[PDB]
Design a binder for this molecule. Structure first.
Ligand SMILES: C[C@H](Oc1cccc2ccccc12)C(=O)Nc1ccc2oc(-c3ccncc3)nc2c1
Ligand SMILES: C[C@H](Oc1cccc2ccccc12)C(=O)Nc1ccc2oc(-c3ccncc3)nc2c1
Ligand SMILES: C[C@H](Oc1cccc2ccccc12)C(=O)Nc1ccc2oc(-c3ccncc3)nc2c1
Ligand SMILES: C[C@H](Oc1cccc2ccccc12)C(=O)Nc1ccc2oc(-c3ccncc3)nc2c1
Ligand SMILES: O=c1[nH]cnc2c1ncn2[C@@H]1O[C@H](COP(=O)(O)O)[C@@H](O)[C@H]1O
Ligand SMILES: O=c1[nH]cnc2c1ncn2[C@@H]1O[C@H](COP(=O)(O)O)[C@@H](O)[C@H]1O
Ligand SMILES: O=c1[nH]cnc2c1ncn2[C@@H]1O[C@H](COP(=O)(O)O)[C@@H](O)[C@H]1O
Ligand SMILES: O=c1[nH]cnc2c1ncn2[C@@H]1O[C@H](COP(=O)(O)O)[C@@H](O)[C@H]1O
Lengths: 334, 336, 334, 336
């Protein structure tokens, strides 16, 4: 078929191959770039969703060396106050999301000391987005991350128009139904590869957004060219997320919903669902495990930093049965 | 490899459409299309010619929303003419009707009743008897004829040369179809549309993608690789306007939906190649069709395509694995 | 690696592509060669298993135009009597299985009027199978089908030593655990193709043995080069099979076991299991559906005979996802 | 495509061995193999060095049947020496024992206690510390050393150059392993054996295939593609002789089986990379081993191979799909 441009791989399709190593998981540097001008101690960002990130989550993230993006599902004043709450909790970095044409919101956020603006849309590669980007860059001084995209052409054009970071991901989210409602998407490993191929030569960080299920996925995302990953579902279950708590049967769940779900849209046909995730308690322990798995990954790959990981990493493509071998098999877990 | 292996076939679940630079919003795209070389539709949806899907009410519903319904042939000629008359007496609405091989008298009566298109459908559209029936209709009356079902370039080419005004594609992909297991025969639906489109497009003859549409995203996929429209069965079978009977099983209400090649449908009036099944009741078709149209607009927005013609020009896809598909649907989260 | 000789396809991996057709399913001729000198009206053979084929099953198959192979899990006299019961019921054709070195059994079966001897082994391409074959051919005159094999070299050697039919299948059987226990096998479509590539040069019929689950599988097997197919589990649940009945809940089951199962061997680690299949009633109806399915396949393929089907057939490889589209989906059966 | 992609990795389930012309019966095949450069076994089976699989009882059982057990290191040096002595006090019986990085003193005490082989084991064999430890051992004591775990040509080559007497292959394939999930790291076991044996065989150094053996047929596969032996954990964990404790859950007796990188094994004395699980109780190890050896003989008979060396020369395999896998197992029959 003439329109077939190749096979796309997701996190589950691959495994990273071990390298000769002289570096322990504990010695690895997880320091990375959020945007061309902003640095992070760990490569973790909490999603801009109303069931994931408000001030409490963003303080937690920043204290752990990562960063939180305050969602835009609220008035400008309430969003500015969330930013101020984080800035008033010490010298802590914080970000905030805006939509297309939201120049006024952007200005007010920047006035409030926000470190990065995340200009996000279901379809980053669009005329309205590029215009908003250009308007912001000419009217205020701040780093702008733009998303969401999955192609080299999208990456190249956004960078040409002033993007300080590029957020990658259409379809891989746990609550996303874009692939089913619209039939559109690119498997996340392939999308990071394609965007990194353009972005890295201009020094522009890729944020891998969506579909992180396990700590092993973080390593994979960074290995193929991401500077950081944005995480929703894994954190929505923690104590510091704004979601409500409901007892289903005997276990407690936190609400977690796409920002393109009918409920999130009430507060276009939906491209996200309203779901539940198991409660996980303090985010600190959750994040510790995530950082733990990534250090372990970099130790296996003999990489003392993310930059080194990019030069040293390789992967094998596996089958669904190879996936069976990867997980736990034939043993009941206690 | 084996000598008889002609390559890998892809279905809807095997691919994903790649986003393009877009200057067009979903609300702005034109869904206008051609049903046949002489008949146009405002949206590219057709309801299946099945006795659990399309009679007069469903056809009226379809036409009002800009699509079309094909009245099934599991009824006497007079009953079928009358159903067509119902739709025609309800405004100036377009409507189709199905006929079987050699049913020239039925075709004539349907055309006189003001039917807009005849659908000459068979389980195996690439056959001598079908072609004979086609030639005879085209010589005895003046009307557009859609012929199916086929899955190959040679079949598409032969039908067009003999006067087909539209080509219906699909052997095996239908939800109620067991052709692939009873006969071992079929072609995955993406590959079949591509093969047939590669021939029909230069002739300007529309391809109807028939069967296996489960989600709105499949419509986008089907059109993107060369279909001008899609024909839909199971999705509409559960609606208020379909003719099937309703059964309460446990708590939920179900509607009957059966293949026209199941034992029950063949009794109405060879081993079966369809099953008799049930689908959940979904209420008014308007809300169902609104979603489908909505998802297709979203698709065309992502693809920067203001029209179906542009969609054919601009679209590309990636093939994905089973684990890729798991990432497409909902994962690790319990839906409410 | 260097030992990877390619991808192997089974029935479920492929679909036959429709051809231009001027032949109705009812007009299709199903006549075929069982062996070089024995013909059948339909290409169906009942398996040589103690839960499938004794005289009643063999009479049933022969009346419908196929053939039954009386199993060897009984003393010589008992097997001869089974053969005599079929021959006493008209001119009806019948076959009988023997094992390696079973020359006396062969002689007796032949004297009793058997039409074909099936020299059966787990591993047909072995020195002692060849020696048994050579010994049979020089001491009596009948057609001998030899199996089971899956390679070109096996087929060539057996034919050169006097085989009148070649039986293909290691691993694909419903009750077979050879692939799990020994790690050995070849997917059935690839095995038929490989063996047909040699046998057809010599006019020697291929029997496709094991793994038929639906009538569609029969068409596939014949399409890629088989002259007939041997069937076990499908017939094992019919009233004519020797198996015993057992009520489980509200469903009636017939026992069905591999001849390499623990229970059959005491009638070496086992390579088959003891199982149950659902009771399907009269065998005539079952066979009607199978024949019906094959006629439909040959109608779609414009082939008026198996010979024409070999000439005209072609197939497409499908994915697991493709297979979900083949079966029934999203609709619950009544 | 994607530039960091080194190719498709195959696990045991992805392949099937192809039968060869055979003149050798299963009962006639020789299963004698080299454990290390200087140590031979009667059968190519090793019990895993885990605290729910191998202590003295298991090690004696393995040795009697022609294989060997590796005493785990989750105990003090004295306790470990004592296990080794018990096996040695039970006839002229082979035994191995594991040590970790820098555990030179432990190694010395084990060697003077008469251990036949030292297994220098780490989650990541291809590391500077492992190599240092290896060189240190080879210079201070006379003993065969098996090093692991690795999955690459370069790792295999470097370990051999620094004095390894055997190479243990396996990162991610074990039943209780979560390395592939937690760290995202691993190589499918067939591919890993092939790559490592491509180097090791040139030097005549035995490859041990460790983890992911689920059925006897997997042993055949592992050896066929170049392993000289296989290490097994879960299969032996449910036997009488494993040191794990029993627990009744429901109406079935289970024994505990846990990774040595599970939170409970590390508490026993980093983020965990193994789980704490349960396997069904299976009685005597002798019966279990008989079946395993039985399957391997059957495999070598199908391949016309009278010895493992001949099996390396003669073996070939075909890749299968998950649908081919369906066919391999039992299907459509309810097992009694
Ligand atoms: C309703 C849907 O919502 C989302 C989809 C995906 C991710 C989401 C993340 C957060 C919140 C909402 C999300 C959507 O906006 N869909 C959609 C589809 C196609 C579009 O195409 C365009 C567009 C095309 C050309 N110019 C401007 C916009 N916007 C689009 C929006
Ligand atoms: C029983 C089966 O019914 C159907 C199968 C598939 C789709 C259906 C949709 C609506 C109604 C019935 C359907 C069938 O007609 N099977 C069948 C199979 C092969 C055939 O081959 C020919 C044929 C070949 C050559 N010339 C004329 C007809 N008709 C055939 C019919
Ligand atoms: C126990 C197993 O049984 C069967 C396996 C597969 C199909 C069956 C069908 C009917 C009855 C029993 C069957 C078997 O015989 N396995 C087996 C495995 C390897 C062998 O290798 C040889 C052999 C090798 C070289 N020369 C002669 C025989 N016989 C073998 C038998
Ligand atoms: C906690 C984890 O434990 C295990 C993982 C896999 C297999 C196991 C088998 C038995 C016992 C524990 C196991 C681990 O050690 N992970 C880990 C991950 C990366 C590492 O990288 C290095 C390392 C890198 C460079 N030089 C020395 C060591 N050690 C590492 C350990
Ligand atoms: O409803 C929506 N539809 C599709 N994607 C969404 C929606 N809401 C949020 N997302 C994306 O999904 C990501 C979260 O992915 P997760 O970690 O896999 O749950 C977010 O960071 C957004 O990029
Ligand atoms: O019994 C039959 N066997 C095979 N296909 C059928 C049968 N009856 C209807 N169809 C086809 O299946 C389509 C419906 O597919 P669905 O939308 O996937 O439910 C119809 O438009 C016909 O092309
Ligand atoms: O126990 C056994 N192990 C392996 N194959 C067997 C055994 N018993 C019978 N077979 C084969 O399996 C075929 C039946 O396959 P089925 O039709 O798929 O049930 C028989 O005709 C034999 O070739
Ligand atoms: O906790 C762990 N994480 C990963 N691998 C382990 C762990 N503990 C033991 N292993 C490995 O897994 C093997 C057992 O694999 P199994 O036979 O598939 O159960 C052992 O011999 C070790 O190589």
């Amino acid at each position: 078929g003439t329109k077939n441009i190749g096979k796309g791989l997701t996190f589950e399709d691959i495994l990273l191959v071990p390298n000769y190593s002289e570096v322990l998981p504990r010695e690895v540097s997880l320091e990375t770039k959020l945007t061309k001008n902003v640095s992070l101690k760990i490569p973790l960002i909490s999603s801009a969703m109303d069931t994931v990130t408000e001030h409490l989550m963003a303080v937690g993230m920043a204290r752990l060396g990562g960063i939180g993006i305050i969602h835009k599902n609220m008035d400008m004043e309430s969003q500015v106050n969330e930013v101020l709450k984080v800035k008033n909790s010490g010298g802590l970095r914080v970000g905030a999301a805006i939509g297309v044409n939201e120049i006024e919101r952007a200005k007010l956020l920047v006035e409030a000391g926000v470190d990065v603006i995340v200009l996000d849309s279901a379809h980053g590669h669009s005329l309205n987005i590029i215009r908003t980007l250009k308007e912001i860059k000419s009217k205020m001084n701040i780093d702008v991350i733009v998303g969401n995209v999955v192609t080299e052409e999208a990456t190249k054009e956004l960078i040409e128009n002033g993007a300080d970071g590029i957020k990658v991901g259409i379809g891989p989210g746990s609550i996303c139904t874009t692939r089913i409602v619209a039939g559109v998407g690119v498997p996340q490993i392939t999308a990071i590869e394609k965007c990194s191929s353009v972005a890295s030569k201009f020094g522009i960080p890729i944020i891998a957004d969506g579909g992180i299920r396990y700590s092993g996925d973080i390593g994979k995302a960074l290995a193929v060219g991401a500077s950081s990953v944005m995480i929703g579902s894994i954190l929505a279950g923690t104590e510091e997320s704004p979601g409500e708590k409901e007892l289903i049967g005997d276990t407690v769940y936190k609400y977690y919903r796409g920002m393109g779900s009918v409920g999130a849209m009430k507060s276009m046909v939906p491209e996200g669902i309203e779901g539940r995730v198991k409660y996980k308690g303090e985010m600190e322990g959750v994040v510790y495990q995530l950082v733990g798995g990534l250090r372990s990954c970099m130790g296996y790959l003999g990489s003392a930093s993310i930059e080194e990981l990019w030069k040293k990493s390789s992967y094998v493509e596996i089958t669904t049965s190879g996936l069976r071998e990867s997980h736990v098999h034939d043993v009941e877990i206690v």
